[PDB]
Amino acid sequence: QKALPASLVPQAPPVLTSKDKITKRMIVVLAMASLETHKISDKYVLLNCDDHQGLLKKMGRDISEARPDITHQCLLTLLDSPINKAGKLQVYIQTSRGILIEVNPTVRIPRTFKRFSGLMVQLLHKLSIRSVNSEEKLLKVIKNPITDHLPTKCRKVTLSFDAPVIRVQDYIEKLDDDESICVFVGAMARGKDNFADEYVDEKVGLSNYPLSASVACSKFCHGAEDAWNI
Amino acid sequence: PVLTSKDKITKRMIVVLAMASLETHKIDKYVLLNCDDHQGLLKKMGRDISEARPDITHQCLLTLLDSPINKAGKLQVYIQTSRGILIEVNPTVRIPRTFKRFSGLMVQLLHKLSIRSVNSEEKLLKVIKNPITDHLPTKCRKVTLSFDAPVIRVQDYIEKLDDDESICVFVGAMARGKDNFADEYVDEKVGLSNYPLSASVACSKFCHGAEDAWNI
Amino acid sequence: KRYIPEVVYFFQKILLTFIVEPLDFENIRLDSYELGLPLDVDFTKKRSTIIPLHTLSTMDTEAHPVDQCVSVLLNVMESLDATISTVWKSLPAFNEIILPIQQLLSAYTSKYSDFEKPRNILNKVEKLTKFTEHIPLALQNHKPVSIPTHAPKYEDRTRSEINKMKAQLKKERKFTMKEIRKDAK
């Protein structure tokens, strides 16, 4: 009735960066994530919540805020997720300070927090990081703003707790064809969901129960994979 | 409500972190046998370097604890150590999200051999003797989440199960190991996706699907 | 528990040898058309079976009775049905595997209509074919491969020492130049 495709080598899906501004895909940003540099004096370091608190205090900021653990764990589950195997989403980190980060969907996030932090300080001072084969820069700090990096046909929502709840399967089936999605998550420890409410349209909720950013990201990932049959 | 092993009737989900690497050491007090904190000491002990990783246990634990079905109170966590130690984890505790306090909590668990609340009404973390069937309920189905088995859509499977036939899901939290460890316990092996996943994302996918079939 | 096409060919050939004493089966290439079995079989259960008692049959076979050929025929029947239930029911090509064998034994029944072990062979053949499903193959299916991933990078002595010495030379010469300029002015 209809021929099979000519070649049947199961090829890798086409890898994606932001330079493609056409293909329908998914993008997750981590908003207000805390990744801060400091120079202890004889070593630069990433600010960490538990171990250094009085030096946070002598700087004067809030130990209730300065915590990259949730960023690391959310990043781990996202870039581990099976849609990231299917090659259909990429990561944008919008720091608490303001730096744009494009994370390629081919990197392998270091599993332990110390290695992750060492990578992070190398990034935040160096601006680019190459692979072990050294021909592709996997991490790209880039220029504000993010909507001047996104694809053209996108809808932009935030993930808030107070918002009315929907089924993300329903939402992705409500979408149009070339209309990609753009979900802003709040990776703050404890703060108000007012970060990108001039950027994006509408707020969304996934339960009447509060979550973490991590399990919210997992919920959105699996609603995505069920909506796209992958 | 609070779901304990003393309840043994209604529909629930029980997770098994099988052979999860959790070893402690005595330097002069205790330290967890984390890989990256010290590898030369592991070279001396002969236990291979890339096999003891309790941070993966931490990630799976955070995932199961902050899953929405935990807020629905419908799961409970059983850890099987590689050295014969059952640990029951209750559905209403906030395990730390920081690795330092987490590893300290592991060493103090491993040499207090029980954890109760200072609220002192019910326990938080329990150290009980294996096998697991002693606490596994009556109408219990035991399924390995294995990569080689044919995959099955979670919604169809959860609804294909009966009402009171409760479910126990087995995941080997290790980095690498041959997956025929759970056979003397499990009913059957099922796959979930075409790709080598992670334990954490597999457990999250399963609780999300169960969430969908029970409409939380 | 494997398969041998040479065995199925053996069955084809040997049964046509016992029928020929051609037009229905010309895809066969028989050898000695003569030594068939005419219509004189008594087919009692007291006839000689396999009797795996070898050289007494082997070195003296040539003086053929009807009885020894009947015996080697029923040996063939037993061997066929045994490896049928051992392998050939399980194999996926079962259907057109057993098509011409079914032809052969139905020809024996249309010839004689007397044996019952061939008759029950035919019956179990019908049961196995009515039983099995015979779907086309699905050999070519593969799980989708993922993306290639990578690993991040983060943390020549004499050449770098030459570098640092050159920086020190430049810095010192410029500094002394500044000093000489100031004092002279």
Partner: peptide
């Protein structure tokens, strides 16, 4: 190659 395994080490 790498699939839920970790990293290399120097």
């Amino acid at each position: 190659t790498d699939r839920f395994k970790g990293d290399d080490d120097i």
